[PDB]
């Protein structure tokens, strides 16, 4: 297998990386491990002007008043249990939020605060017919409402949530109160089934009170049944959100409609779907195991025809210290982190299960050492039928010693071994900033993007509105608009010139500069700066962009372009003129 | 016969051989990357808000940013390390903000941003490089816009006898101005001379125009040299002027009625000018003719002379101007007396022999070129190892290009800018890996792996977080033990010790509308164990490496219950260090 990619060369598959605590989506080439492209989505990115333009801050909403967000899990949009590469989805447990990535553009297109929880952690899609849903777990259990009046995580109103967005819409479609909390989650390939291991089923706010007791579970959703129950109009609403909330608690013992709960131990982390769909598998932590729920008991489970939730479970095999996650190469073997151990340990899962009943038989097939203390991993393609079998990255929270010294902060190390074969082989070390949780790949050919915008995307389409209130026409118009202390300049940008070169504006006015990049050309970026008044934005081939400010000084201000486009790059510059406050009405 | 045949493949395991610390461009950070390897080792914030360290949202960053934390954005181009007799000392790395008119300074030893200053009475700091001898005492930095003095909004003609831009002094060790130079026409970029007497810099707007034609109606613009010795006489002896309310001394550099300053000389070059690069065997400042399809070499020891008006003609200090391609842009040196420039248009690198070009502009017939390289494409700056030093070894170069097209994958209408690794070992130039990059890179620079000694836990004592220190002095609190919340009306400042896997402070509460100041000592002693503060939906965020003390300052505006959480996965128990604040309701 390939395993370097030389001058001239491309990379065989998309990389999606989380951007951990730094809050972006990051685009790596694979088997080269390089980074092609940084995606902005929590963060605010001083180069293409994402959460400072207009039009990032109308995606982000009343939440781009955050700086920050901290992102684990990204997955990919999928059509019958396949990639097809139209959404990249992906949480920010900092700030309560999903995002979604639209993968022709390459940018975040829709973001949504999820309504009455806190933490967005655990996220995956639904596999079939198609990504409906995207399920997202709230980890933190806290009262409702959570006013002041409350603060016991016991009270029967202290509950955290189950979480379902409509991929299309990114509107809130459900939510589900469950018992205990939500770390991860997966989904089957019938859409009837998601599941979410679970490791606070104490209610408890300490460390000790969460490791008492001996089993936590993995909680199975129905979502048939929920469907059901909001067709039917079945359901409450929480505070002034009219997402239908559904009850998946027990009461008195008894199950809801909706939720059935496997007792596994213990605070089990990872919840992964065996590629050929026929197991959740839940990686038991603080137990040395992971815990093989079969998919095709689940409908008897919930029809009563088991005695003991356990009866779903078909293997729990002894693996090593500290199981986080598993992933899957598609001949039937999983591979999972062994935090403590430090390992990779690669196992079949049909051994596993015979084992269980009893048939001594050893289904561990080889344990790697990784550098160090492995949390996530990914195998390519893992998460569809297609599961390729090729190339397995494992995402470790410890470098140590395996790269050059740079202070006090460690770079991550996510490690790429080559699973083609037989036997794992580690072939490249990889640094990551900031704490990549988890990856996703994708083939060259799963993935299809644009090169120059379309004039009516919707990602700009409210400043499009915008401009025509204006009577503007963005693609011919170089105009300064007044309309009281609001000056709205339009103009087009093609190099190495700004279409309004000058403008001149009174001292206090609020100032939208909207540029519309009317080059026909690739790769023929222009960028927008202000000197000295924090103002950034990128204006890609066809693409219009705008940005607002105050023009709180008097004098003259420069602005130029960012991206070197020319060789008269540096000469591509405009000026503001800001008349003193002391010459206009006081 | 040598032949260039260095490894670049860095195996598992193994460790790069230098370091090279990138330029973040419009993105606005520092990084740290690995050669050859050239893979990314560690992110630096300066002009960004980093999501994940908390720079920009921490007490401690925004001290050190000082009023400039207002703005979310930076842009830069040149990165340098400082110097002890000609030789990098692995103290300090400066870099520039063309976007609001800063210079940063790093300290090596903890990869942090440890200083800034927003340069006064300019806008927009673009070229920057250091004093080499006897050590970099001064930051050199040019303002590239002309602007009217003062910038009041009575005068805009940039025409006017008090428009102008300035070369400026920043003390390197304080931080502070050390003194401004006016300068007629604008400045680009800037290097120093081998003995610290002199240094230079290009203009390309000798005309002071506004406008793309204007800037190009000079045959010639000029590189201007600065006599240093001069400037500082004349600050010792009180002879300048202060502009508006900064104290830094102004000296007047610019031509008076055809007159020359007793600080500058101007030599006239074409056409306007871009790179400006010192000879590593100090002899010339090469100046790039971009428009000219020439470099032009002047002979550092002839200017004192030239100073001395021993000499007939300010054009007699060029001693060489060879013809080279279209579009030079920058020059490096390899250390064995060649030169290695970059030809935009015609996307190479072209080696040069300086000695041979000096006689051939005598008149010798004599070929000085010796290979050109094509590169992919469009290159700007290009650096060879310890080019800037009288140790410049030939080993590595690298040609920073802007445009890759399709030499990766594509990633949608933004591209990566290709960063190219060149062998030059050896007698040929050899292509050896393409490295894609974010945001435009401009420039960078390289470092042997024995010149960079990094600190692997912090110092208790470390400035960095010094003031907070101090604040923990005036409430009583020993940071290394305590943990203890001060009431103070409003303000509540929480003082906490953090160890895997528990916050020292689990719990407090609150009166909503309280000012909240978490302090939290990461009070661990093994490398690489670092934790994270996030307080979930409240934009709060920062890290907390070994033996570090950082703080952040938040509203409680929300009443109830509001989790906090670590963010670096620090412990198998991770996902439980965990923290409640709760929220009284007004
Ligand atoms: N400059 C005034 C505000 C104002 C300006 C212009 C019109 C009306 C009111 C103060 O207060
Ligand atoms: Cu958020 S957890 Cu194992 Cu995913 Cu990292
Ligand atoms: Cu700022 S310019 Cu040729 Cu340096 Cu990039
Ligand atoms: Cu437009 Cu550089
Ligand atoms: Cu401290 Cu994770
Ligand atoms: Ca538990
Ligand atoms: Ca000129
Ligand atoms: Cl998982
Ligand atoms: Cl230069
Ligand atoms: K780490
Ligand atoms: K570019
Ligand atoms: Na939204
Ligand atoms: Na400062």
Known sequence: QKIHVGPGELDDYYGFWSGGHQGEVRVLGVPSMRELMRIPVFNVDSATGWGLTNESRHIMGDSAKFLNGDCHHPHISMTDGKYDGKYLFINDKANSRVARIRLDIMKCDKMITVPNVQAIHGLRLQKVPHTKYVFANAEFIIPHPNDGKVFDLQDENSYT?????????????????????????????????????????????????????????VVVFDIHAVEAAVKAGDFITLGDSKTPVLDGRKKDGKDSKFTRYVPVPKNPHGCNTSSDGKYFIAAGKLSPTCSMIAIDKLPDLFAGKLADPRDVIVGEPELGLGPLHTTFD??????????????????????????????????????????????????????????????????????????????????????????????????????????????????????????????????????????????????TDNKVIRDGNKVRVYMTAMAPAFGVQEFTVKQGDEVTVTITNIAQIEDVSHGFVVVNHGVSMEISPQQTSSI???????????????????????????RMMVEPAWSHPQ
């Open 161 to 217: 949530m189950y979480n379902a967005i409509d991929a299309e819409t990114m509107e809130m479609a459900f939510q589900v109160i469950v018992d205990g909390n939500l770390d991860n989650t997966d989904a089957d390939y019938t859409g009837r089934f998601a599941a979410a291991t679970c490791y606070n089923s104490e209610k408890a706010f300490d460390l000790g009170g969460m490791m008492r007791n001996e089993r936590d579970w």
């Open 548 to 574: 607002t400010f105050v023009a709180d000084k008097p004098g003259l201000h420069w602005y130029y372009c960012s991206w070197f486009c020319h060789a008269l790059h540096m000469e591509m510059v405009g």
């Open 330 to 475: 598609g001949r039937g073997n999983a591979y999972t982190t062994l935090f403590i151990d430090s390992q990779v340990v690669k196992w079949n899962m049909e051994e596993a299960v015979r084992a269980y009943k009893g048939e001594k038989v050893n289904y561990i097939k080889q344990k790697l050492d990784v550098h160090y203390q492995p949390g996530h991993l990914h195998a390519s393609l893992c998460e569809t039928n297609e599961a390729d079998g090729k190339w397995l990255v494992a995402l470790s929270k410890f470098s140590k010693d395996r790269f050059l010294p740079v202070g006090p902060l460690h770079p991550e190390n996510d490690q790429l071994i080559d699973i083609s074969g037989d036997e794992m082989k580690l072939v490249h070390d990889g640094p990551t900033f900031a704490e990549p949780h988890d990856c996703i790949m994708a083939r060259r050919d799963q993935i299809k993007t644009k090169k120059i915008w379309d004039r009516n995307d919707p990602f700009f389409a409210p400043t499009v509105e915008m401009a025509k209130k204006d009577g503007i026409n963005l693609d």
